[PDB]
Structures are given as C-alpha cells and as structure tokens.
From a paper:
[name] is an NAD+-dependent deacylase often deregulated in cancer, which deacetylates either H3 lysine 36 (H3K36) or H3K18 with high specificity within nucleosomes. We show that the [name] N-terminus represents a unique, extended nucleosome-binding domain, reaching across the nucleosomal surface to the acidic patch. The catalytic domain binds at the H3-tail exit site, engaging both DNA gyres of the nucleosome. Contacting H3K36 versus H3K18 requires a change in binding pose, and results in structural changes in both [name] and the nucleosome.
We proceeded to analyze the complex of full-length [name] with H3K36MTU-containing nucleosomes by single-particle cryo-EM. Three-dimensional (3D) reconstruction to an overall resolution of 2.8 Å displayed [name] bound to the nucleosome edge. In our model, the catalytic domain binds to the side of the nucleosome at the H3 tail exit site. The [name] substrate pocket accommodates the H3K36 side chain securing it in place using residue F239. The map permitted reconstruction of the mechanism-based adenosine diphosphate ribose (ADPr)-MTU conjugate, and the observed density and LC-MS analysis were found to be consistent with the bicyclic intermediate also observed in the X-ray structure of SIRT5 bound to a thioamide46. Instead, the [name] catalytic domain presents two basic patches that bind in a cross-DNA gyre conformation, similar to PWWP H3K36me3 reader domains. Three residues away from F239, the side chain of R242 binds to DNA (3.1 Å distance) at the 2nd DNA gyre (superhelical location, SHL, −1.0). Opposite of F239, a highly conserved [name] loop36 within the NAD+-binding Rossmann fold makes weak electrostatic interactions (4.7‒6.2 Å) with DNA at SHL + 7.0, using lysines 272, 275, and 276. Remarkably, [name] interacts with the octamer face and the H2A‒H2B acidic patch via its N-terminal domain, which folds into three α-helices that extend across the nucleosome. Helix α1 binds to the classical acidic patch residues E105 of H2B with R11, and E61, D90, and E92 of H2A with K12.
Numbering used by the authors:
A (entry chain C): 15 to 118
B (entry chain G): 14 to 118
C (entry chain B): 20 to 102
D (entry chain F): 25 to 102
E (entry chain K): 10 to 119, 139 to 362
F (entry chain D): 34 to 124
G (entry chain H): 31 to 124
H (entry chain E): 39 to 135
Write the structure that this text describes.
Amino acid sequence: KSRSSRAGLQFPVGRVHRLLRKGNYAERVGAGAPVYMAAVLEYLTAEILELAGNAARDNKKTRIIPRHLQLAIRNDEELNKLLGKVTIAQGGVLPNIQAVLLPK
Amino acid sequence: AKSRSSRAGLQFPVGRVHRLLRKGNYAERVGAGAPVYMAAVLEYLTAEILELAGNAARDNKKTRIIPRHLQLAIRNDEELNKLLGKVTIAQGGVLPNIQAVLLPK
Amino acid sequence: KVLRDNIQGITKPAIRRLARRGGVKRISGLIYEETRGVLKVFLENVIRDAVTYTEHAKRKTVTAMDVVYALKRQGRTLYGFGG
Amino acid sequence: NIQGITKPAIRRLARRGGVKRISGLIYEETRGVLKVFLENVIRDAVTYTEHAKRKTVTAMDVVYALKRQGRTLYGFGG
Amino acid sequence: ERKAAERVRRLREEQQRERLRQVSRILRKAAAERSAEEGRLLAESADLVTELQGRSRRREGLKRRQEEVCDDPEELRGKVRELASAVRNAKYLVVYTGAGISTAASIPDYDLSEAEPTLTHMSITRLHEQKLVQHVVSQNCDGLHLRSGLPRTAISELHGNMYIEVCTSCVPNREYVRVFDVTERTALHRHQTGRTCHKCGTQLRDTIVHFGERGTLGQPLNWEAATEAASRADTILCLGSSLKVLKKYPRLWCMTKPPSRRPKLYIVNLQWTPKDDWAALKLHGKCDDVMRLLMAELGLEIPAYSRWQDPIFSLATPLRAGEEGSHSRKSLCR
Amino acid sequence: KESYSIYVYKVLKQVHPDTGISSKAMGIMNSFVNDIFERIAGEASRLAHYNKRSTITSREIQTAVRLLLPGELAKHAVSEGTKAVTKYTSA
Amino acid sequence: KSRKESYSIYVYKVLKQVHPDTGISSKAMGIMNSFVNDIFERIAGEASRLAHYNKRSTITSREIQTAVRLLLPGELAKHAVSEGTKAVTKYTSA
Amino acid sequence: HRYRPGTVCLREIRRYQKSTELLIRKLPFQRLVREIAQDFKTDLRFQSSAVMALQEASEAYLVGLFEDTNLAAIHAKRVTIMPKDIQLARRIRGERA
Amino acid sequence: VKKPHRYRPGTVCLREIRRYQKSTELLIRKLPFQRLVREIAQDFKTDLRFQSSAVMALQEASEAYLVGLFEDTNLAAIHAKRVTIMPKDIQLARRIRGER
DNA sequence: AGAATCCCGGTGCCGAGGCCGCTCAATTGGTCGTAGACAGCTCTAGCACCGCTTAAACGCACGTACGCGCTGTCCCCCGCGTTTTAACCGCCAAGGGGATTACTCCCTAGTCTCCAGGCACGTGTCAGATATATACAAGATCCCCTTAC
DNA sequence: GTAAGGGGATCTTGTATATATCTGACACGTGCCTGGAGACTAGGGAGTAATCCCCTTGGCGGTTAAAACGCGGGGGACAGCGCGTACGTGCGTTTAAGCGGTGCTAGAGCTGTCTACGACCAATTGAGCGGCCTCGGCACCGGGATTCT
Ligand SMILES: *CCCN[C@]1(NC)O[C@@H]2[C@H](O)[C@@H](COP(=O)(O)OP(=O)(O)OC[C@H]3O[C@@H](n4cnc5c(N)ncnc54)[C@H](O)[C@@H]3O)O[C@@H]2S1
Ligand SMILES: [Zn+2]
C-alpha cells in the first residue's frame, strides 16, 4: 500500500516527499521525485555497507565499527573521491610508510 | 518622499531587493528591514572597491576604470583579497612579483 | 571532418610565455608534456560538466552561462562573462 | 596554556603522519598553527551561539562552523 | 591599522606626484628662453640643476664626437713634416688599414666589382717596396690591396676576402684566385661556394668571416705573421679606420706591454677613435692628401694604376667547363 | 526524533545477513545519508531555477545525480532510479 | 526582446559620489554587476540557512547582520554592520 | 643491547598507524579551548560533545599537515622535517598568502 | 673571432618576466585552442555548437589555472635549492594542492 | 642467542537486538486552478569557404653556468634510565539555563489602482589608440690603479 | 719584479616619454510602459511570562602511568670541489594564425491554448518511536609460539 512498496525500495518515500516539500527548494514537487531520491540513496548505502562488511570480515569480527567504514571508503577509489573533504570520527589512517625512509 | 531608498538615504534600490528576496526561495516570509540592510551593505562594499579602483586609475594617468585597475585594487588590499580569494577577473593580469633569489648578484 | 591530435597546437613558446607570467626563470625540457596532460584533464572535466548543463535544457548549443555554471561548480568562479 | 600541548604529543601526531625524524624547532610552529586553527573555528562557533540567544556552545555549533570552512565532520549529529 | 588611518598613502602620492611634476616642468624650460620672473630662481633646485646640466653635458659630449673634425692646411703641413721625420726614423713600422682608405673609390662605409685601386694603395705599395713598410693589416674585404700589387706574404686580411676560394680536404689546404666574387649566397654558418673544385672532388667554401664566427683558415687570414709583426714593430700608423672593431684584438695593439713600451701610433682619420688620447700625434684630414704630401716630403714618386696592371687576371684559376654560368655578377677583364 | 536507523538496518540484513552494527557506525551512516540528500536536493533546486521552472521532477534528480556522483556510481545509480520509477509507475 | 535588469544606474551614482570626475567602461561594469550578484547570493543563502537552523519562517535584519558577520573578514565587517544599522535606524525613524 | 637509531622510530610509526585512539590529553586541550574562547565572550559554557568534536577536528588537521610536510621534506632529499617544510606546505595549500 | 654584443644567460629571462607580468592579454593562439576544445567535446555529444563567449570563457579559465600552477611549481623548485623547474615539482605541487 | 609481537584458553560485563504499547504522520478520496507540452513563425548568430600579408613558430649551432656525484666534519637527535608530576577515576553538591506550554498583539501577505523611474534607441564629441622622434637607464666589457708578493 | 683584484669610463640596446591625428565608445536626451508605491483587510508567527528537572561546573583523595631531565654516541645535514651536458641566445627559414568578405541555414526565442498535474482539506488507521531486558561479542589476563635484530 505504501508508495515505497509500490516500487520495491526499503527507504521511506513519504518522509522524502515531506522533506522535499517543506525544504524551500521549489514551488512545486513532482510525483516521481521521492522514488528517485530513495533509489539513489538506497544504492549508495547498500554499496557502502557491502564494502564495510567485507572489511569487517577480514578482521575476524561480526560487527562494523567506524574503523571498517573508514577502511572501506579509503580503499575504494570512487567512494574516496566522493568523501574527500569528509573527516570520519574514530577513523584512523591507512597504513603507509614511505620507501625512502625504510632501512636498506 | 516616495521611494524607499530615499527615506533610507541610500543610492541602491530597496524595492527591487525586496522583490528579489521574495522570489528566490530563501524563506516563506521576509521582514521589512532586511532589504534596507542588504542595500546598505552592498552600497558600502561597492563604494569601497570603487574608491581604490579610481585611485589606481589615477596612478596611471587615466580617467576611466578598466578591469586591470579593479584587479590591482582588489589584490593590493588584504581583506578585499581574502574575500575574493577564489575569483578570476577577466583581462586583469597579475601583480608584478619576482623572487629575490632569481635576481642577479 | 573529425578533429584529431590538436593538443600539439599548444606550442612550446606559449607554455614559456605562461611560465614567464608565472615568474619562472629556467625551464627543463620535459615540462611541456606534463603541462599538456594537466591542461587536457582540466578541459575534460569542465567541458563534461558544461555539456551536461546544456543537455538538461534540451538545447543543441553550449552557452557561456553553462560554462560559468560548470566553473562555479568546481570552485573557480569567473567574473565578466555574465551572472 | 598552549604549553600544555607537550612535545611527546606532537611526536605521536608526527608518527601517525609517517614522519621519521623531527627537528627541534618544530614544536613552536605546531603550537602556532594549532592556535590559529582553534581561534578561527571557535570564533565562528561563538557567532552561531550568539545568534540563537544562548549561553552554552553545543556540538551542532561546532559542526556548522567546521562545515563553513569545508571541513565536514561525521559522527556528532551532522 | 585602521582603514581610514591607512589613508596616508594619499598624502604620500600627492606629495610625490607634486614634487616630480613640478621639478620636471620647471627644469625642462631652457634658461635662455625663460623670462626673468620665471627663471630668476632656476638655481634654487641645486640638485636638479646639476643633474640636468651633467645629463646635457654628457649628451652633447657624445654628440660632438660623431661629426667630422678637420685641421687647417697650415697645421696639416706642420704635422706632415714631423710625420715624415718619424717615418724616416722608424725601424719597424706596421700599417693598419680600414674602410676610410677605399672610400675614395666610392665604396660605402659604416655592384662592387667595378672598383679600382686608389692612390693610397699605390702609395702603400711604393712605401713597402722601399723597406719603409714591412707588414700591412687590413679589415677591408673589397680586395683592392690584392689588385694593387702588394705581395700576399706581407698582408693578412683578418676578415677574409671576396675573391678567393678555399678547400680544406687537402692536408696542406688549397686556395684558388677567382675573378668574380663568391658573396652572393653567404650567411652565418653557411659557407659553401657551391662550385666545382680543381681536382679535390669536394665543393669549395668562401673565406668571409661574419660576426660570431671564429677564423680557422691560414691562407687569406694569416694570424701568425700579423701578431709577430705587431709584437716586433716599434711604431704604428693607422689610416682611415675608426678602430671600434680592431680595438677588440689585444695582441694587435700589444696591450700586455707596459704603457711606455707600447709602439707610438699616428692616427689619420676624420672622426674620433678610442685610441685618440694615446696618439703620439693625430692628424685630421683625408688620408689621400696626407699620403700624397708625405710622398712629396720624402720625394717619393707617384705610382700610377692602369687597368692592364691587375695581377688578378694572371693569377685567376680557370674554372671548370660549364660552371661559369652559376654566378650572376660582372666579371673583371683587362 | 527521526533517523534512518530502521532502513539502514534493513539494507544491512539484506546484504550481509549474519552481521551486526554498533551505534557510532549507525550515526555516521545517518550523517552520510543527510549530507547526500542535501547535496542532491540543492543541486536540483539550482537546476530548476536556472531554467525558469517552478517544479522539481525526476529529470532534475537525474541530472543532479549525473553532475554529483563520479564514474560508474553515477551509471548504476541512474539505472536503479529509472528502474524503480518505472516499477512504481506501472504498479 | 525583453527588458533586462542590471545595477549600472546605482553603481554609476555611487562612482560619481566617490570620484566626481571619473568614468568607467563596459567590461568593468560587467565585473561590478557580477560582484554584486555574487555577494547577494552569498548573504541570502547564509541567512536562509540561519533561519532554517533556528526553526523560523522569516528573514529579518538580525539574520542579515549575522550573515554579514560570518562572511566578512574584519574591519570590513565592522564598518558594514555600522552602515547597515545607520540605514535601518534612519528608515524606521522617518 | 642498543638498537641502532631508526628501528624504534618505525616501530612507533606502525603502532600509531594501526590505532584509533586520541593522541593528546583531554584536560589540557579543554583548558586551552576555554582560554581561547574567553577572548570572544566572557562567562561562556560548553558541552562535552563540543570539546570532543574540536579535538577530533584538530587532530585530523594536524595529521594531514604532517603528511604534506613529510612529502615536502622528502622532495628536498632529507629525512628530518624543518619549519620551512611546514611553511611551504601551508603556502601551497592556500592557508597562507 | 668577431665578437658581437651578447647578453649573458638570464637577462632576457628577467626582461620577459617583467614584460609578461605588466600585461593582461591572452598568451595562447585562439584557433588551436578552439580546435582542441571541440575535439574534447566530441566525445560526449555529436554535432555540437559553441558560442564565441563560451570559448573565450574557457580560455580565460585555463590560462588563470596554468599561471597559478606555475607559481606553485616555482616555489617548489626554489625549496629544493634549484632554479630550474622539473616535472617532479609539478607533481608535488598537484599532490599537496589536493588534485590527482 | 634474544626481546617484541602475535596466538590460544578462560572469564566477565555491559551494549545490541527483540518485544510492548501507543500516537502522530502517511494514505484515501475528491476538487480546483494553472504550469508547461505542443504547434507555429521568424530572424539571428553560428558554420563554411576564400585570398593574403606577415609575424610567430621552427631548426640549428655554440658555449657556459647549473645540476649532480663524492668526501669530510661536527653536532644535534635518538635510545635508555631514573625521578617528578599531574591526568584520570570515582564520588558527591548545587544552581544556571535550556526546553516546553499558554496567550496575545501586530507584522506581513494579498489585492486593487495609479504614476514615475528605468530601459531601449539615437547622436555627438572627446579620451585613448597609434605613429614618430628623442631621452635615458641598465647591462657588459676594458683598462688603469692598488695591493700582496 | 710580477700578477691578481677593485673600480671608473664607455658603448650598446631596449624601454620610457613628448607631440600630433583620429576614431569609436561613453555619456546625455527622448518615449513609454511595466513595476513599485499607497490604502485596506485578515490571520498566523513570534515575543513574553512561568515552571521544571538536566546538565554543567566545582571540590576532593589515590595511583600510576606519562612527562621532564641527564648522558653518550652515531648518523645525517651541510659545505666544498670537480665535471659533464643541457638549456639559453641569436640567426635564417617556413608555416599558419588573423583579418575582411560572402552566403546559408539550423536553431534559439516568443506567442497561443488546453489539458493533465500538483496543491488543499477532512477521515482514519498503522508504522515508527520511547522503555525495558537478556544474553552473548569482544576486551582483559596469562602462557607460549613465531619473528625480525
Ligand atoms: C669579426 C666580424 C667581421 N665583421 C666585418 N666583416 C663582415 O669586419 C669589418 C670591420 O669589422 C668593419 C669595418 O670597420 P672600419 O674599417 O673601421 O669602418 P668604420 O665604420 O669604422 O669607419 C671608419 C671611420 O673613418 C671615417 N672616415 C670615413 N671616410 C674617411 C676618409 N675618406 N678618410 C679618413 N677617415 C674616414 C669614418 O667617419 C669612420 O668613422 O665592418 C666590417 S664587417
Ligand atoms: Zn682539398
């Protein structure tokens, strides 16, 4: 019955429609705009969660923590470009030591 | 007096700024003193830039301001350069600057 | 007629003039290719954004307003061409 | 109170940055740059706090002030 | 600093522009063309007065050296006697030459095959055949010295010749006298006559030296005997040369010698040369008249040039058949 | 208060069934979703304003996604949005 | 064709106020128009964000003042604030 | 024995690049924050979240700056960083005119 | 040797620096730049048309970008006790700037 | 050989995932006014070609100043041990001030009428562009004079 | 007696400056029409007072690990020297950018209309939000196994 179930998405559509309607973006809001919104947001969150769960599996843990999200974002090139100006709390750094500083 | 800019003692339009504020999707309602404040601030900024541009034009023995004079005025002042830090002005050039190490000894 | 290999039209003296305006006194011999690559990347990005802007409006001509919008979208605001 | 940023702390931050050896005139420069950064961010945060007619600086004021400078931060209510 | 308090640059600029424009437009007025009221206090700006006075002084000092300076015939005939006495008392004299000597042949200074040797060249030859003159250095490229009759063993044209072709493939190197010039298609670093040799099997090259080029041949421009003669000679007689180019060769003037030990130079040229201050006695006037008067003073005769007296025709190397048509100038005939 | 904890958890159990999550990670995910929503919405609003329009359709959202997301992310997001819109309209 | 709006009439009046015997060219006019539009957009966007943060539907002069303080660096901000307050006081009193 | 100078330096690099905690004490940073803020408005108050967020942002900024500084130092054929490296990094980044 | 007047290596470089820092004109010929822009554009849409002001704006932006990049490169070159600029200077400038 | 770090076993403890109950926000249904999709016309600016005159690009030679490798020193960071200190933890009090609710005046949107300010078009004359001849300001080299030998 | 180094005069070249001629763009005037100003109505946003119970600031006693201090030694920074070659300066040659016409046609821009679509409002039911719990996932402590030095 819900407009989300009419498209298969798991994200809300009424919430997105209300946020677009009272967000001071335009005079009128189309009918299919919240469906597009929810589709794109769902794709992005699903992909990020897949990569983070992979990185959590490589560390022999059953839960995801900000370290794994940071690892997933930093390792992949596309998500690294998207979240370039973003600082993640309790993230850390990618392990990297310059070769010229390594002993011979 | 009829014009709202004359009552505020400004040279910038108040009615036009009010209409632009209303038809811009910034807020549902717009107060009565906002256009006056905005016109005053914009007038102050434009006069401040224009004075330095006119001085730089007179320094070159010319009586008409061209983009080079605007660029010189903007880049030669600290705060105006900080404000317009990521702006490119067409036909403006650069400030002359040579590093000291490159000059003959 | 299709365009092919026009990056060579940006000549070495032009790069030297740009460098002199930048304050450069001595130039190596491998700088020209690096400059050409950097310029190509920059132009690719800007023109892709401008083409997207002009295609949204169901148009067939790229306008200066689209170029200005694309530049402002990358934090490179430009004055004197409208806006 | 800037001297409460000890030298081992700067060494640890440099280690996480990948630095091997550190000169002896680095600590004062680090203190100066940190002071400038904090001054700017706190100035913007206090402005945001003053507009809302409050006396307490909340985490959202810091988040907005950071976002104004292009230093977006996640995990505090963004 | 306050923005308004930072308006001291306006007073700075005002004072600077005022003083500069005032002093410029005040001192730019000539005193002789100024009135009493505007010109009474010209000397008030002492520094300005001395600066513009020195600038103008150097200006007409530089200008005054660019015009002809001549001596009246009384002084000329007074100087020629002492010059003749000096040349008679001279032991080892070398003669330097320049563009002014050939000027009497309507040759430009700083077609050319129609020129002929002048009186000065004949006087030089007659002086040389009397042991008075031993070595001659020249900078002219016309080649009138060759046509005069002066032996090539005692001359060295340091800038080449327009009537000689050279081949370097041979171990001792080869030279050939050509009646016509080879200067038609000569440029910097492009030294190729484009003509068949005699038997070498390689194309010849010209002999002209351009600015920036370093002389390497030894046949037309001998750089050993000239230096040796300039080192051994105790007197110098330059004629018709400004010496603005020859002054760049140190060994020719023997500049390493102490100033007292340097040979005495007797310049004869109209304009002013940078060696003027060290001249033993400079003469101003046409070198042709001076040489004629020198010959009259010494009693030496006047050699006469004839168009059948050119030795170039006898020494001209015959050209390979079919190669004559390449050149596009006027040949020389007896 | 409102959040996307309920939906992100659903997507998580969809992708990795035998995995849990803490609270800080969920907060970071919420901030991510809010940031992306604001970016796309603002870009679409600008697009509508430039063309002298008054409504925000799905064309605005699609062009915003093209101008914002990089690389193959844009391709896959555009495809999923078109497919979801078609399924919603037909159903 | 349609009527087009610009700020040349006001910019020229301000220029004649400051330098009474100076001119201006067309390219400089375009640069000045772009400058005014850019500053207007910046301040209006900041004020709208400030209104949304505090859950208010109205843009008043307090929002403009706060946006001016946020966006202008120094004594520029101080002088602009004083000028705006003077203008609003004169308008309200009269 | 005595490790040759350089081993413990890399050991610490690995340790602090394989970690997530904070590298500055909390009480001194709070004290510095309050003393800086007292010059904008007297009698101010703070929440713990505000000071935590300030600390996280500052540490991230300093770590990134040190990365750029190390790159600049390596470019000059050295191993140790100097104030001129910090100045060059800050000037190229645009933080200084 | 007939030695003419000749400036030492470095004088004309500083003379050119002053000449091109006192001017405002464009330093790239227009026809090759327009050809390059169209060639790049033909990989996103076929048979496109360009306004003259669009190409002028593109040229202005590109020249400003290149001048700024060369200034940063010169600073990087000076830092390493050199006078000449080399590709690694450009790479370091772009890496610190945030590009790549 | 030998310290530093990962691997395995056993325990504890609080945080993530479910379950209950409920209340506001999304869903249904219909209605009304207007935005924009589509057809059509026009006129303007973007594309294509041609001929020419000339300045900029290009190829080449020469030499010199700069970049790079090697060596020596000396000095200033790093690793280790011992003493000094203040951060962190857990506990307990107290009042400021953020957050919610109720009520009332008044400020702003909406509408109609009317006039004047600003925009499109036209015309002239003067400030800046251009050619021409001088003046001068800096660079490059030579030669004389001074000093250690 | 000899030679290396310091400084004034000079020549050259490129840039700045004074004077006249001219041309196109800036500045001022005119017609007019569309947007801003004047007057009035109604209704909801915002300001003001009151109350509470959350949260921030302050003080106190241990303890224990982190910071500060001293010392010795070795590796890295930096100066100095020699050498080779790559890059700058200038000249002669070749090419293609820039300019001024001539012409055509796609495609941008504007006008009319007419219908489908989005905003508004009253009912009403279920999806998401606040509280409580329960039990396991991960950190902690200790012995030994591998691993660079
Ligand atoms: C190594 C480069 C070679 N360049 C060149 N060959 C291509 O070498 C010569 C030579 O370098 C130079 C000729 O110099 P010059 O012979 O001294 O002629 P200059 O211009 O300096 O004038 C001489 C002076 O003598 C005066 N003068 C003119 N007419 C006179 C008469 N009839 N009598 C006496 N003096 C006379 C002139 O006023 C002039 O000042 O160019 C080639 S190029
Ligand atoms: Zn031979």
